[PDB]
Amino acid sequence: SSVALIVGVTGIVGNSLAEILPLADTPSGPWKVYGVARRPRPAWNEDNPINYIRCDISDPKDTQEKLSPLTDITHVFYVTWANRSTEVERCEANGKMLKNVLDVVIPNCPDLKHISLQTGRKHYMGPFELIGKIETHDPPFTEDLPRLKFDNFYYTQEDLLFEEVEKKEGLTWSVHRPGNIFGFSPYSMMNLVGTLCVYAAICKHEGKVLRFPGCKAAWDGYSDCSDADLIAEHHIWAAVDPYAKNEAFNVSNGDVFKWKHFWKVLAEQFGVECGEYEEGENLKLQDLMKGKEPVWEEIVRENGLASTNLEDVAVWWFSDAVLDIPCPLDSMNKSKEHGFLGFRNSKNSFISWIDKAKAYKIVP
């Protein structure tokens, strides 16, 4: 029997794993699923048949208490993180979180077969506060070239993971490195689509132009992204395919796009006039959206939306961090050469995730 532990079940990838693992056509099914997060289970996560567990994995005692009874786990899908002001502190916090889970699950789960760890493109680009400031490898990024000579919590986590699997014979691992994720999760710390939807809804309410809050390279250079359901499929594939064992893999959609084009799509989905990149404006959502909580309460009330806090559904700092830089591309050759041929049409994916935020009444 296959028994999953999703660490971060209400996250942008955790929520996609929660929906896909229990499906009839999922490989190695039928899957039993445990899902971990700290907050009470939100309404938009209820449409999935998972065993929800409240647990703060930064707390070793809580991790011991909540996870030690789950002796039937066969596959761990680790899809969470903690943000801090410096990468050094991110290494400390994130290493402890992964260590707390693995130290409990490995000795208590005799049928444990695989640990899948989600990291991301900052493995190649560097930490948030070094992006654009350091020499990186030239894109498109490939998986197995040397690491940057700077601390990175993904390196800390990979090294801990490799040491942890040594504790159990036959225990394999995988690493998954998405770019910017397009998905659904009103609780995610990094949700570009959800944040852009809230910005578009505020522009619509105020009768304002959907101005582009980003740089020229993000507007008309190439970009890519990683669909959350495709990432969930990629975690499942690496967890069950023996030819994918003990490898790190990028996971992006298999196409490229330009924000100059997707901006028209976003504007059309909210009935707003589409703006365009303007040289010298240096527009930031974190600044434009300051003090917009009463406007959000009004949009929620007038449109019969689910009651959300603006700071949870719109992570302005993250949208600015994405859109204020060029988007270096990555390579899907290693995944495809290992037999993973999943892809997504990114424009159709963007519309799908905008429409899911509308379907769950998060935005109008």
Ligand X SMILES: NC(=O)c1ccc[n+]([C@@H]2O[C@H](COP(=O)([O-])OP(=O)(O)OC[C@H]3O[C@@H](n4cnc5c(N)ncnc54)[C@H](OP(=O)(O)O)[C@@H]3O)[C@@H](O)[C@H]2O)c1
Ligand Y SMILES: CC(C)=CCC/C(C)=C/C=O
Per the annotation, binding residues for NADP(+) are 8, 10-12, 38-39, 56-57, 80, 118, 181, 188-190
* Binding map of ligand Y across residues 146-185, x = CB under 6 A, - = no contact: ----------------------------------x-----
Tell the burial category of 261 from Cβ atoms under 10 Å away from its Cβ (0-12, 13-18, 19+).
middle
Residues 264-303 as x/- pattern, contact with ligand Y by CB under 6 A: ----------------------------------------
Q: Out of 78, 154, 187, 199, which one is annotated catalytic?
A: 154
Three-state DSSP string of 208-273: CCECCCCCHHHHHCCECCEEHHHHHHHHHHHHHCHHHCCEEEEECCCCCECHHHHHHHHHHHHCCC
| Nearer CB in complex with Cl ion: 61/133 | 133
Instruction: Report the alpha-carbon distance of residue 171 to residue 164 in Å, rounded.
Output: 9
Reference 126, options 89, 91, 152, 88; nearest CA is: 152
Region binding ligand X by CB under 6 A among candidate stretches 79-87, 139-147, 272-280, 327-335: 79-87
Site string for ligand Y, 86-125 (x = CB under 6 A): ------------------------------------x---
* C-alpha to C-alpha distance for 87 and 92, rounded to whole angstroms: 9
Q: Which residues bind its own copies (CB under 8 A)?
A: 138-140, 220, 222, 254-258, 260-261, 329, 331-333, 336-337, 341, 343, 345
Q: Does 229 bind Na ion (CB under 5 A)?
A: yes
Q: Judge whether 149 counts as a catalytic residue.
A: no
How many Cα atoms within 13 Å fall on the side-chain side of residue 223? 28
Using an 8 Å Cβ cutoff, are 127 and 90 in contact? Answer: yes
Binding positions for Na ion, 297-356, rule CB under 5 A: 349
How many residues bind ligand X (CB under 6 A)? The answer is 31
Among 321, 331, 338, 358, binds ligand Y (CB under 6 A): 321
4, 21, 57, 300: residue in contact with ligand X (rule CB under 6 A): 57
For residues 224 and 235, what is the distance between their CA atoms, to the nearest angstrom? 19
Q: Which does 227 bind (CB under 5 to 8 A by kind): Na ion, Cl ion, ligand Y, none?
A: Na ion
Residue nearest to Cl ion (CB): 120
Is 190 a residue that touches ligand X (CB under 6 A)?
yes
Whole-angstrom distance, CA of residue 138 vs CA of residue 362: 39
* Single residue of 89, 220, 324, 355 touching ligand Y by CB under 6 A: 324
Using alpha carbons, list the distances in angstroms from residue 208 to 212, 274, 340.
12, 10, 43
Q: To 5 degrees, how large is the angle CA 30–CA 14–CA 310?
A: 145
Per CB under 6 A, the segment of 103-111, 159-167, 257-265, 322-330 that binds ligand Y is 322-330
The yes or no reply on residue 55 touching ligand X (CB under 6 A) is yes
Q: At residue 118, what are phi and psi to the nearest 5 degrees? A: -90, 125
At residue 217's C-alpha, the angle toward residues 287 and 188, to 5°, is: 50
Exactly one of 96, 99, 113, 122 is catalytic; which is it? 122
Sheet containing 51-54: give its strands across: 51-54, 31-37, 2-7, 75-78, 114-118, 172-178, 247-251
Mask: binding to ligand Y, 47-76, rule CB under 6 A, as x and -? ------------------------------
Q: Which residues bind Na ion (CB under 5 A)?
A: 227, 229, 257-258, 261, 349
Q: Which residues bind ligand Y (CB under 6 A)?
A: 122, 128, 131, 180, 321-322, 324-325
